[PDB]
Amino acid sequence: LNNVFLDFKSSLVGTGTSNNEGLLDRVLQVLMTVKNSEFLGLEKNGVDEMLNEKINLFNKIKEEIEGKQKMTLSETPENFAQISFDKDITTPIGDWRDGREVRYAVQYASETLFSKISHWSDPVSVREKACPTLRMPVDQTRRNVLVFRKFDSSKPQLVGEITPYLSNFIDIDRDLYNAASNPDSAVGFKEFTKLNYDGANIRATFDHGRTVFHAAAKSGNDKIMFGLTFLAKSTELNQPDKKGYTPIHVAADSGNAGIVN
Amino acid sequence: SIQDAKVSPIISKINNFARYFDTEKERIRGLKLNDYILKLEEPNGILLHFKESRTPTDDSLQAPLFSIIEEGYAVPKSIDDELAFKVLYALLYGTQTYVSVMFFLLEQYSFLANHYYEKGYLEKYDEYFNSLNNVFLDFKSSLVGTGTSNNEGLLDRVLQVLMTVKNSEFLGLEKNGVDEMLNEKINLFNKIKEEIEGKQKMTLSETPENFAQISFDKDITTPIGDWRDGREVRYAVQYASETLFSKISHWSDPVSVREKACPTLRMPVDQTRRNVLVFRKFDSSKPQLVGEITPYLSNFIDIDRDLYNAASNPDSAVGFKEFTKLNYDGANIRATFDHGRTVFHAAAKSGNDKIMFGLTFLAKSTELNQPDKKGYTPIHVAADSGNAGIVNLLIQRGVSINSKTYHFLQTPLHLAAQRGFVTTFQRLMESPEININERDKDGFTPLHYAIRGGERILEAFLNQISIDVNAKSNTGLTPFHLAIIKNDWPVASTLLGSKKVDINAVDENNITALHYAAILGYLETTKQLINLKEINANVVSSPGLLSALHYAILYKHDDVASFLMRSSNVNVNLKALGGITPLHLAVIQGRKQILSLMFDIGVNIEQKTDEKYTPLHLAAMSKYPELIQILLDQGSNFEAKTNSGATPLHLATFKGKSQAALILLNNEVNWRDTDENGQMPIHGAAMTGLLDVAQAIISIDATVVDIEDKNSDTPLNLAAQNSHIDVIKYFIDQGADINTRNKKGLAPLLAFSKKGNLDMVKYLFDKNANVYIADNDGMNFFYYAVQNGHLNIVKYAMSEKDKFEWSNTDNNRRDECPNEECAISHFAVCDAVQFDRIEIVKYFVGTLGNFAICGPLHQAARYGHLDIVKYLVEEEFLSVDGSKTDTPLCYASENGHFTVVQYLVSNGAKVNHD
Amino acid sequence: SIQDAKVSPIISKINNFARYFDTEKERIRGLKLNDYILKLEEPNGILLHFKESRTPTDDSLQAPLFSIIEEGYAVPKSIDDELAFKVLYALLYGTQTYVSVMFFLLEQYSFLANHYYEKGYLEKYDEYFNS
């Protein structure tokens, strides 16, 4: 998309004035030459007026192309500067497996324009540690950045959002989210309890605004829902998503009768 | 037409390919970085098409080139239209595009190969290396050939065609010049041929030999390091060429590991005796560099790189334990990897304090300050990573704080400012002998990178007691300048609040940051700084005396300019160099609403430049005609005067803009007003060559057909000199008087003879206009006609023998030459001999019955022309003595021409004769 | 002139293909071993072009010769039919180049086949076998 937009835009009018100035100006020039040529009284005078309205249409579309803005963002943010497993956690929790490698990527967060995802970082072997700490340089343009994580060649997963003036990026939020969304019940409950004891926020947002409550509703776990509903303020239980789905909507879609009651 | 049909496809294709390549060349050269990468990496883009451009396919280059070469249509056939020459130029232009595409492909493939080699992605690096090698070899063979053989190459064939055209020599009035820059093209082709022969391959194709044996003699327990049970290991070898690229060899067979971790491998001795780098890969993960082999090294152990990964491990306790185990087993620390990288640098990258603490004991000062090939000292890497404990340990060891990097000269303080970590700076300030500011390649202070870092680093720097806020770089940009050009207002506000900053600071060209904001059209920043801060907006730049409003108006930035003119803080009467006022500059840009707004605010309509030009005149001096209409609707002086008195209609006719003249006539601007020279605008219209204005002015007043300025030259004479058919035909449709003369005495017939068109000549001769017209000097039309050397006008003149008589002679020429009563034909032949044009002399000889009356030998001896004298002595059989007692040898001796005298002596003429 | 214009594109194309193939025939043979494999293994190399040369596309080899034989312009008509002998010679040249290009790719494909066979690499060996 980026290539075709830039290249076609250069073809029509050009990114800058030059000896060619696009093919539209050549069409205008040849039409002006036709005007300068001798014309008939009535009939190809009508041809003259229809080519005049064609010239008006060409001017309008040329102005639209010049005023047309780019729908993509070729600029790319910077990856993490240093990584360290400072947290005292044991490895066999969540997707963190011995002998596995993790690749991180960053992308600009633009609401109206598409943004390029950065090249994946160098592989990092994981052993005896599960929760990594990422340190990020301050953004040049001061834009919030989405962060993506990939294990080996599996499905990449969005993991969080970084503000321009935040550097100490801890990686526990998506681990908790997957703990609440795991198909299993007992293992998911135990690892959720371990992560909660470790320390992780609840209002984290993923997948168009879904929350640990939405993940619990979709998975169908009952013990974690019972643990969460205690000391839970009613606003988060009715928190809607970007599309507008609520936890009860997700529960109805999943079809889990217990969480419904 | 048939030949044109035959040649149109190939010529259209070559022209289209050439223009496409040129447009893409500038487009690609004008791109950004990620844009460059995306465009160059397109699966089906211009790189593959350019590689296929040397294929024998239809749309390629070589097929049209060899087709036009073989068919032989480039060589002209006698004299014809400009089609053989045009296809020849097309061939030359296509060959130039071919060699330019060759260089284009070389440079971009080399850049791609380097860009993917620096990262370490060998899979794409190998593909780009092969592409570059194939492109180089194929294009070198296609241009000149691998050797002198029957193929002969392509440029040699082009030169052969050029010599064939040169020896064709059908005509030479201009073709000797044409073939002359064809010889220049031949020299250029020879130069580029010598360049490509002298150019060497940038790729080393030959690959080394892999290891001959593998062993696991060393007793290392397998879980340690990157050694995983059940994981395959592969090795590759590459030549270490500092100047050229080297191919990576094919990977070795998978090798399984179990209970052993450190392998011992044996390498054969290389024949060329060059060091070879060894690459190691685990499964499909990222390949790593494990070491280098000297020509006379047999055993290689990769334990050195394993220690490098041990020091770079993200974990702390496991990394320290494995480092201790490897040190106990025995591994050197002086080993280098990647971009000349050092183990201490890896320890700095990891940030593990344990390995640093262990290494500093029994260390050396030079090792702690040892840089890589890029000049990144360990403190540089520590500052870039952002760790604090390793920095504190390094300071306690007394490392060099003023370490600098090659090429881009940056201290670790610059790295900290760019990254934006206030902790690293606040830990570095306890180090003594530290310098607050440094001079970079552009002299950029660390504050210039802190403003990029963020607000917190700026607060940290401004909190320091020792800081130079008004630092000036080599380019001349103060910190405020490039802090505000980036549009981060909060950081600029933080900088201003902490301590006073010289807002009125200027560059060498007297450029203020406000001027940058105006020229770049960020209106919000301009409003913020104008309202909440005080600034002198009347400062002018050093070149051109341009101001803030001028910069805002330039490059069509209308909102900012409107905001500035709405505010009363900045004035409008300010005058720049050249006299261009805000009204004049808005006219140059041609924006309407800006002019309407500044007229609403209030300004004099008749602003004056240095030369008193009225804004209406400059509105005529613009591509937008609506400016004249809007100015006259708002009210403007129709008869406004300048220092030269030039009227807007005068200027419009001088430039020749038809729309301006049409709208001025529609608005009925008086044409009576003249300039200082008194020239009527019809004179400028004739200069440009506009006709509709001529009919309009004749309709308004027919008297202007013979109007004259102080130059006293009629418009008909000027139109004839300008060589425009329409105006001359028009004035002869009214039929202006032919006897009108200026002070120079030039006549329209003189200009027609200068142009040489036979149609006007036959109208003038049928009009029976006198050809004996003379000016104050006394020269006549006949002399200029003979000087022009136009034969067919002369034939048509002698066809009507009634109007001109050869026997009759002009009396004025008899008066000017009382001694020689030469006739018109006689003296004309003698002048033709004087003109040194042999063709004209032989023309007159053919027309005139007896050429001996002029005595061409004596005249030629007087003029000292070798060729004429030789031709008349040999082919005309002219007697050397001549009818007169004076020999031409006396004239030749008087003139002193060498070859003429030698030839006359060889003819038998004697110098002894009186 | 019209007859020459009619036969100009096909004769030019067949001559270009013939001379290009003759040049590459000794270009490839005199190339070093390491560059030989790299030159052959180009994704859009000359081997793919030679394989496509059998297709009925305009740029391929058959369309000129088949057009010549179908239209019957190779047979001289009347005296001084210079174009007839020219297109006939082009036809024989095209047939010779077609036979030589058929004999060409077999050696390189067989060589790639066993060269990869010695070290395994059966994924590429299967592709070369099919080719």
Author numbering:
A (entry chain B): 283 to 543
B (entry chain C): 152 to 1065
C (entry chain D): 152 to 282
Question: What did the study's authors say about this model?
Answer:
The potent neurotoxic venom of the black widow spider contains a cocktail of seven phylum-specific latrotoxins (LTXs), but only one, α-LTX, targets vertebrates. This 130 kDa toxin binds to receptors at presynaptic nerve terminals and triggers a massive release of neurotransmitters. Each monomer is composed of an N-terminal four-helix connector domain (CD; residues E21–D115), a central helical bundle domain (HBD; residues S116–K350), a short β-sheet plug domain (PD; residues Q351–D453) and a C-terminal tail of 22 ARs (ARD; residues I454–G1195).
In the second state, the HBDs are moved closer together, forming tight interactions that result in the narrow conformation of the central core. The CD assumes a dramatically different conformation and is completely folded out of its pocket. The four N-terminal CDs are remodeled in an extended coiled-coil needle, whereas the C-terminal domains preserve their overall arrangement. The distal end of the tetrameric coiled-coil needle is formed by the most N-terminal region of the protein (helices α1–α3 in state 1) and might correspond to the transmembrane region of the pore. This domain however is flexible and not resolved in the cryo-EM structure, as might be expected in the absence of a lipid environment or detergents. The particles show characteristic mushroom-like structures resembling the cryo-EM structure of state 2 with the (N-terminal) tip of their needle inserted into the membrane. We, therefore, conclude that the mushroom-like cryo-EM structure of state 2 indeed represents the pore state of α-LTX. During prepore to pore transition, helix α5 separates from the HBD and undergoes a reorientation of almost 180 degrees. This way, it forms an intriguing rigid tetrameric coiled-coil with the α5 helices of the other three monomers. In addition, helix α4 of the CD folds into a continuous helix with α5. In this manner, the coiled-coil elongates, positioning the N-terminal helices α1–α3 of the CD at its lower end to form the transmembrane domain (TMD).
